[PDB]
Amino acid sequence: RPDTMLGVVCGALHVADVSLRNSVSNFLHSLERGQVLPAHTLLNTVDVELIYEGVKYVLKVTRQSPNSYVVIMNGSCVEVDVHLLLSYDGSSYTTYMKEEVDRYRITIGNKTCVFEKEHTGSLPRIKLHRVFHYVLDNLVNVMNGYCLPDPFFSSKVKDWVERLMKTLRDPSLPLLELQDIMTSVSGRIPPNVEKSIKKEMAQYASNITSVLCQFPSQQIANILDSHA
C-alpha cells in the first residue's frame, strides 16, 4: 500500500486542486451575479491539519504555476504538477478521493488509506536552453499575478535572476535554441534552407566563446527572402 508522505502530497493537492478550481467557479458565481467578492476568496492557500498516529500534519497548499502545485508543511515547498494525472519523484500514479465531513479518505488504485482531520520539515524531491526558458517563464508567470507560497521567494528569485542575466549574456543561447529547434523540425525540410541553417548554426557554434560572436540575422532572413 501507499507511503505516508506521498499520502500527504496527494492529499494536499487533491483538496487544494479541487478547492482552487472551485474557488474559481465560486468567483464565476459572484461575477455573473454581480457580487464584488474580495480577492482572497480565489483561495490559493488551503490549510490541512491531519493527525495520523498522533502527530498532526500542519500544512498549507498553494498553486505555484499553471502546471505546478506546492505542498507546504509549516512553510516548506514541494512542487508537483498535474492536469487526474500525477507527476511525482519517480513515477506516475492514480489517485481517488472520498471526502467526509471530518475525515479524509484516499484510495490509490486498488489500495486504500484513511486519515482523520481533527511535524515540521521539508522533502528533497528535486540544459541551458530549458533552464532559461523554463525559469524565465515561471517568474513572469509568478509576476502576472499568480501569487507565492512562502518567504523563500526573495532568495529564490535572486538565484533565478542571476541565471537569467548570466545565461542571457552567455552567447550560447542562440546556438542552443537554434540547435534544438532546428533539430526538432529537421524534416519537411528544403535542403537549400537546411544546408544554410545547419552550416550557420554549426559556425555560430564554431564562433561561440569568441568575444565578438553575434547572430547572422540579416543573412538567414535574406536566404529565406530570396527563396520565399
Partner: protein, 78 residues
C-alpha cells in the same frame, strides 16, 4: 477563356465589372503605400532586392498583426 488563363497563372483573378471600381480603388491605394514604404526600406539597406523586400514587408505584417491574420493581406481594405 479567363478560367484557363487564371488557372495557368499569367493573371491573378477574374473580376466582375460592377464591383470593379471599389475593388481597384482600395487595392491601388495600398499598392501605392507599399511602394512608398519599400522605398524607405531600400534607403535603409541598399543590398536587399525588391523581391526580398516584398517578402519582408509581408513578414513584417504577419509579425505585427499575427499569423492568424496572414489572409488579411489579400483583403484590400484592411
Amino acid at each position: 477563356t479567363p478560367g484557363r488563363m487564371q488557372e495557368k497563372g499569367v493573371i491573378s483573378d477574374i473580376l466582375d465589372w460592377k464591383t470593379s471600381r471599389t475593388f481597384f480603388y482600395w487595392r491601388l491605394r495600398r499598392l501605392l503605400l507599399e511602394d512608398l514604404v519599400k522605398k524607405k526600406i531600400h534607403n535603409a539597406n541598399p543590398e536587399l532586392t525588391d523581391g526580398q523586400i516584398q517578402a519582408m514587408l509581408r513578414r513584417w505584417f504577419v509579425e505585427v498583426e499575427g499569423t492568424v491574420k496572414a489572409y488579411v493581406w489579400d483583403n484590400n481594405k484592411d
